[PDB]
Amino acid sequence: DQVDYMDVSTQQVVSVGASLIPFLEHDDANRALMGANMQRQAVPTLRAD
């Protein structure tokens, strides 16, 4: 009865970069940071897989 509100989605504390990391829940924050940063550096290939 004391509850007033609730988080809308499971994803809301995270960014767009970090939302695309699978199993982010099991990654240390420190490596997750670089992963989302390097995901941005990923050159697109000849065949989009």
């Binding site: 988080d7 499971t10 504390v13 199993f23 982010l24 829940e25 099991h26 990654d27 240390d28 924050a29 420190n30 940071l33």
Partner: protein
């Protein structure tokens, strides 16, 4: 070109014109259409020279046909265009302008010399007020300022009777009129009567200047410039951008402002304009000259177009982007490249993969040289095209040049010398550098995209220097610590680990093999596991008393895999070395053993073979990482629910108001931190001994072959700490503050963190990565400070003939001995003849190396402490002797003459600071302190031996300690210290001093999160200066009403009770004071800030009761970041905020008079009847109880020691040991290995200078601090020839000051403070004779150390002979 030294002085107006080759009288540059030098412009050809080589402007005289011809038409000398960067110019300023560096650079120089305030001088410069230059009748005083109104007074009354003027002219005439000889005498003779501190300091500095001003040949006139020199054009170039746009230096823009205002001033003087107009122009001239020289110093810097300020001359000299730090103590280099590095696990340790096309561009001149020799190319242009076409013949010749021609490989950051290593190049197919895995530790190079720089040693000397010094195979041990840096990691450790370790039966258990080769036969044949227990015949060679190896054959019970590894093992090592299951720590000992037994060659081949087999058997193993490999204990949810209930209990007691906020904070962290230990011990117990296997007998168990376990147990990568986060519990996370978050993460990475657990984890993630970016530079700045002080120091002499050294007791600290005597004393000349216990036969000679052999004999006889020759005690003036330093830790043998120790020392200290700032920061997620030291448990039986302890017995019947620095020893049967602890203040001892204890006994017990104040007398409690609201506060509860009192400090205190000290006074039943047994001290314990008190006024107490409880909140996890500032402060020799007081002279104490609480000590020694008096603060409870035989350097106030007080009272060896122990304790907390000798090196540089007390027989006389080396060279001739002996005192210096105190001003201006160094050197007329390394690095000469050592001393005999 070659020369002896460089000298600095002020430029005379006359001297400025000598450098000039014409006056620039116009601010014009170039004609916009016909782009040429303008008529007497800033880029004039008539003044600075022609734009093309040997070509006048008009073009009448071309080429060398006209050699030294000055064209009559345009007026231009037919010379090289080289002359345009070399010839300078000048500007005849119509009016004098002050030189900002001899005005603003404090001390003011012009003001310090005039004894006239800078404010007063500036008023004269900007024409606010007149200054009297020479008041004819002394009605008007000299150097007295007159306002514009006050000038008008004297003008009507006196007129010519006084000469007061205004502007730079007035300060220059003021500097002209002053006599240096007459004023200097007067200052000497009138210092006699007063003699204070700051008068005698400033009046003596004025004498030093006046005398040095005379001896320098400088005039005070020249502080003000009448002539302004111009920089040569090519040094401030107007060149064309490819497009039509041009570009120019910011100096051209500042020169133009100066010339415009100077030419206009000449015009307004020509026009005899009113003075109001003329003054504005003279202010603007001062502003433009001051902006030219140093832009941002006098006022707001003049900005150009970009909004940024114009870069001045001073700016191209001063600091980081100045010539010194960027284009002179460091350079861009020919025959260099780089690329992304990648493994070469096939390579040998002396090799590296160098790409084809890289090596082709690198070695171009050597190919053109071979192509002409073999007769393939006629000329170089022809050879260039052969190489550009990449002909088949060229690859063969390239291949020829590179054989036996080494290449240097470098990584950023270059923290220590091993950051550069030489290899033999191997040409490879791809574009990526291949690096040898074993040298990866020195570079700190991982292959996740590191890049490395390539350099070609061109000259033969450089080929030999590369191969003899900097080759990878010569550089195995660390110069910081005598241990190998070349040590297998990762796959290699895991592979030898998998090989050696055994397993129950397995395939083919208890078999019997002919040799190590039949073991490889059964494994490759597929009949035995590497883990089968087997008897094998192995023949070990062990080395005899002489050089010869003795062969011994024996049946050995080992696994198949262990037999196979013996094949790698060279002959000379026992088989005992490969009989255990090998981890990283053991494999490092194998190469260290092998290095000391066999030599360099065997180790290099052994190290390689270990690498090869380690990788290959790691690959065989197929070791892997699955989610099931991360075993969680079944009892995790059990541990957490118990530990949750314990923490809920303190928070429920907090809501009641029983336990406070700070108490709960420390108390809750202890419960969670022991719960993390509980889950982790459960995890490692259900992980390590989890394999329960059936043998051919029935059933037993062994260590688990869980893949992750093997990886952390072998030490290949990860540790038990990391496995907690994986399988166990993540633990307490750190706040970005450093203080620990009260809610820890219960979960692990296998189970997954939830939304909040992640959010909490990110606090610690960001703060770690933050220190990797920011705090690295405080650490790297230490490296730099350390290097600049030790730079110049080199091994000069073989043996100094000094008898002295530092006594090294073993670091036995905190139960387990932290550093043996053996480790601390190894590779060091025995100072004194140090024999065995029974003093009836010498064991070790005085001037002799400590080899591992002699160090083992020290343990046999149990040598306790050993006096050892140190760098600090060396009596070499020039540098250090080889003996005092000892063994080169990197080489394992006596240090060579010529080796640069200063730099090696700085680097070893600096590097681990710097690299550890990046290490457990990227890798750090969590916090892991465990500072809950409740109770000492003694482990061996012993007699209890306390020292520096004064306890008092309490009502309970317990020995309570009332001394701060109490130590607890553990004395064995014969009577020697095994274990050592710190027993703190207000601690309860189980057994007092001398009593026997058993092993595993709590010998001491106390409360960690509180520092009690305990009494020494019994009776009642009195409240003194404890007024409510001013000094203390109060808070109460309900029905009955329990109130606690909380003492406010100066932060939470009003101005009313500032000079009131709050203290709990002891009294008896009557109401009178209670004397502390055997002393005239009425009992009074001073309570400090934040001190919580539960006993209120009028409460009966016994001796040993706790009066007040001072909070002890320190929940920061101490990483490199929290301890490094301590290191910096120690090396910089800072007194703390509260230095502990020490006795200056040995003798009988008598306490004296008092100043409203503040104590005096009129101590009158037995021999020295003359007294020494010193004031003491009120609140300092003293350790000494007066009237007692106190010696030099006895702790009177408890508290931290100034290193200054240590050196002053207890000599050099005392202060050296304070610095080494205090600094080294900080690196020992982090597990960093730095030999004591490296700290000793820098401490020697700190103990460089010395103040001369008694008069000499030169010109030291009194107060003048000079270097130690110099005063001793005088004392050598004085002790023999005679005359007045010079009494002395050695002084301590911080790094940053000792670096600036060096006589080489080029060393000083290259370190920091460039603006100040140059001006103080210019005024003294100092001459730098280029002594140290910095100086010769600057001039681009051979280092006067290392390989050039030989060469520099050969020039020095040419100088002596005639």
């Amino acid at each position: 070109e070659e020369f002896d030294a460089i000298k600095i002085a002020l430029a005379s107006p006359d001297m400025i014109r000598s450098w000039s080759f014409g006056e620039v009288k116009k601010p014009e540059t170039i004609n916009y259409r016909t782009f040429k030098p303008e008529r007497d412009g800033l880029f004039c050809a008539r003044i600075f020279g022609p734009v093309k080589d040997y070509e006048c402007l008009c073009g009448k005289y071309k080429r060398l046909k006209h050699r030294g011809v000055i064209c009559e038409k345009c007026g231009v000398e037919v010379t090289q265009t080289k002359v345009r960067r070399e010839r300078m110019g000048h500007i005849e300023l119509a009016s004098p302008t002050a030189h900002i560096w001899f005005l603003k650079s404090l001390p003011s120089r012009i003001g310090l010399l005039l004894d006239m305030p800078l404010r007063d001088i500036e008023r004269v410069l900007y024409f606010e007020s007149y200054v009297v230059i020479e008041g004819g009748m002394t009605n008007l005083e000299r150097q007295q300022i007159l306002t514009e109104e006050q000038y008008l007074d004297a003008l009507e009354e006196f007129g010519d009777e006084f000469d007061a003027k205004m502007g730079a002219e007035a300060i220059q005439a003021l500097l002209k009129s002053m006599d240096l000889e007459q004023e200097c005498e007067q200052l000497r003779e009138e210092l006699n009567e007063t003699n204070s501190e700051t008068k005698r300091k400033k009046l003596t500095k004025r004498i030093k200047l006046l005398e040095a001003f005379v001896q320098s040949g400088n005039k005070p006139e020249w502080m003000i410039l009448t002539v302004l020199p111009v920089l040569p054009p090519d040094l401030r170039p107007l060149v064309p951008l490819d497009g039509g746009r041009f570009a120019t230096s910011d100096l051209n823009d500042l020169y133009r402002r100066v010339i415009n205002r100077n030419n206009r001033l000449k015009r307004l003087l020509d026009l005899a304009a009113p003075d109001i107009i003329v003054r504005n122009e003279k202010r603007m001239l001062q502003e433009a000259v001051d902006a030219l020289l140093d832009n941002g110093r006098r006022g707001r810097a003049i900005t150009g177009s970009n909004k940024r300020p114009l870069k001045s001359l001073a700016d191209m000299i001063k600091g980081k982007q100045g010539r010194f730090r960027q284009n002179l103590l460091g350079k861009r280099v020919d025959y260099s490249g780089r690329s992304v590095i990648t493994v070469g696990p096939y390579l040998r340790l002396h090799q590296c993969g160098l790409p084809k096309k890289m090596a082709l561009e690198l070695f171009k001149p050597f190919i053109y040289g071979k192509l002409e020799l073999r007769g393939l190319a006629t000329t170089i242009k022809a050879a260039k095209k052969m190489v550009e076409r990449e002909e088949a013949v060229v690859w063969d010749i390239l291949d020829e040049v590179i054989r036996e021609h080494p290449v240097l490989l470098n990584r950023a950051p270059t923290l220590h010398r091993l950051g550069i290593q030489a290899f033999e190049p191997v040409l490879i197919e791809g574009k990526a550098i291949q690096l040898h895995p074993l040298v990866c530790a020195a570079y700190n190079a991982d292959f996740d995209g590191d890049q490395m720089a390539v350099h070609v040693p061109l000259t033969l000397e450089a080929q030999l220097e590369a191969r003899a010094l900097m080759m990878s195979t010569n550089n195995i041990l660390s110069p910081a610590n005598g241990e190998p840096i070349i040590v297998p990691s990762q796959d290699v450790v895991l592979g030898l680990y998998y090989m050696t370790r055994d397993c129950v039966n397995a395939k083919g258990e208890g078999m019997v093999l002919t040799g190590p080769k039949e073991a490889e036969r059964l494994y490759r044949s597929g009949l035995a596991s590497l883990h089968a227990r087997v008897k094998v015949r192995i023949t070990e060679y062990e080395k005899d008393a002489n050089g010869e190896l003795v062969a011994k054959t024996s049946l050995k019970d080992t696994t198949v895999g262990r037999a196979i590894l013996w094949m790698i093992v060279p002959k000379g090592l026992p088989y005992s070395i490969v009989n255990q299951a090998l981890g990283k720590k053991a494999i490092s000992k194998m190469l260290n053993t092998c290095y000391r037994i066999l030599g360099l060659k065997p180790t290099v081949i052994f190290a390689d073979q270990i690498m090869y087999t380690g990788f290959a058997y790691a690959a065989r193993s197929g070791a892997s990482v699955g989610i099931d490999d991360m075993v969680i204990p079944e009892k995790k949810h059990e541990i957490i629910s118990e530990a949750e209930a314990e923490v809920a209990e303190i928070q429920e007691q907090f809501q009641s108001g029983l336990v406070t906020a700070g108490e709960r904070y420390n108390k809750v962290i202890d419960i969670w931190a022991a719960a993390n230990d509980r889950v982790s011990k459960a995890m490692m117990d259900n992980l390590q001994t989890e394999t329960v296997i059936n043998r051919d007998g029935q059933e037993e168990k062994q260590v688990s072959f869980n893949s992750i376990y093997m990886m952390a147990d072998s030490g290949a990568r990860g540790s038990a700490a990391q496995i907690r986060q994986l399988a166990g519990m993540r633990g307490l996370m750190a706040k970005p503050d450093g203080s620990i978050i009260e809610t820890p993460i219960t979960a692990n990475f296998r189970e997954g963190l939830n939304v909040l657990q992640y959010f909490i984890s990110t606090h610690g993630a960001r703060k770690g990565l933050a220190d990797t970016a920011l705090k690295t530079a405080n650490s790297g700045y230490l490296t730099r400070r350390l290097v600049d002080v030790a730079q110049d120091l080199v091994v000069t002499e073989d043996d100094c003939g000094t008898h002295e050294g530092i006594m090294m007791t073993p670091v036995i600290e905190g139960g387990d001995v932290k550093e043996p005597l053996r480790d601390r004393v190894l590779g060091r000349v025995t100072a004194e003849d140090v024999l065995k216990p029974g003093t009836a036969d010498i064991l070790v000679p005085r001037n002799t190396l400590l080899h591992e052999q002699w160090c083992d004999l020290l343990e046999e006889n149990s040598v306790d402490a050993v006096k050892v020759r140190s760098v600090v005690s060396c009596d070499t003036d020039f540098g250090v002797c080889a003996h005092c330093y000892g063994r080169d830790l990197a080489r394992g043998h006596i240090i060579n003459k010529g080796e640069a120790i200063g730099v090696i020392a700085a680097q070893s200290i600096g590097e681990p600071g710097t690299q550890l700032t990046m290490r457990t920061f990227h890798i750090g997620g969590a916090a892991s302190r465990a500072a809950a030291e409740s109770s000492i448990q003694v482990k061996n039986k012993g007699s209890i031996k306390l020292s520096n302890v004064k306890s008092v017995v309490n009502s309970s019947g317990k020995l309570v300690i009332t001394s701060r620095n109490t130590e607890l020893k553990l004395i064995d049967e014969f009577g020697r210290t095994k274990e050592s602890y710190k027993v703190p203040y207000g601690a309860v001892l189980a057994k007092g001093d001398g009593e026997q204890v058993a092993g595993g006994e709590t010998v001491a017990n106390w409360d960690p999160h509180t520092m009690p104040v305990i009494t020494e007398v019994s009776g009642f409690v009195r409240f003194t200066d404890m007024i409510d609201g001013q000094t203390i506060t109060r808070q109460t509860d309900e029905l009955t009403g329990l109130s606690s009192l909380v003492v406010l400090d100066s932060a939470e205190r009003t101005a009313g009770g500032k000079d009131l000290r709050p203290a709990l006074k002891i009294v008896d039943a009557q109401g009178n004071d209670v004397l502390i047994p055997g002393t005239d001290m009425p009992a009074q314990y001073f309570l400090p800030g934040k001190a919580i008190v539960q006993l209120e006024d009028g409460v009966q107490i016994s001796s040993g009761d706790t009066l007040a409880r001072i909070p002890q909140e320190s929940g920061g996890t101490k990483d490199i970041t929290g301890g490094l500032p301590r290191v910096a402060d120690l090396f910089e020799a800072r007194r703390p905020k509260e230095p502990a007081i020490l006795a200056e002279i040995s003798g009988i104490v008598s306490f004296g008079k008092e100043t409203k609480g503040k104590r005096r000590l009129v101590i009158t020694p037995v021999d020295g009847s003359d007294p020494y008096e010193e004031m003491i603060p009120k609140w300092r409870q003293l350790n000494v109880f007066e009237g007692e035989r106190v010696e030099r350097g006895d702790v009177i106030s408890d508290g931290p020691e100034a290193p200054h007080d240590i050196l002053r009272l207890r000599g050099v060896h005392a202060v050296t040991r304070y610095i080494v122990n205090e600094v080294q304790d900080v690196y020992r907390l982090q597990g960093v290995k730095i030999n004591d000798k490296h700290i000793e090196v820098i401490v020697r540089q700190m103990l460089r200078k010395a103040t001369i007390v008694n008069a000499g027989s030169s010109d030291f006389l009194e107060g003048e601090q000079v270097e130690y080396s110099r005063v001793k060279i005088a004392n050598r001739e004085l002790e023999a020839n005679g005359k007045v002996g010079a009494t002395y005192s050695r002084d301590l210096l911080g790094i940053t000051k000792a670096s600036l105190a060096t006589e080489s001003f080029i060393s000083a201006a290259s370190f920091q403070e460039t603006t100040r160094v140059l001006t103080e050197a210019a005024v003294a007329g100092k001459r730098d004779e280029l002594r140290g390394l910095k100086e010769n690095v600057i001039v681009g000469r051979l280092i006067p150390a290392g390989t050039g050592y030989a060469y520099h001393q050969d020039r020095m005999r040419r100088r002596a002979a005639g």
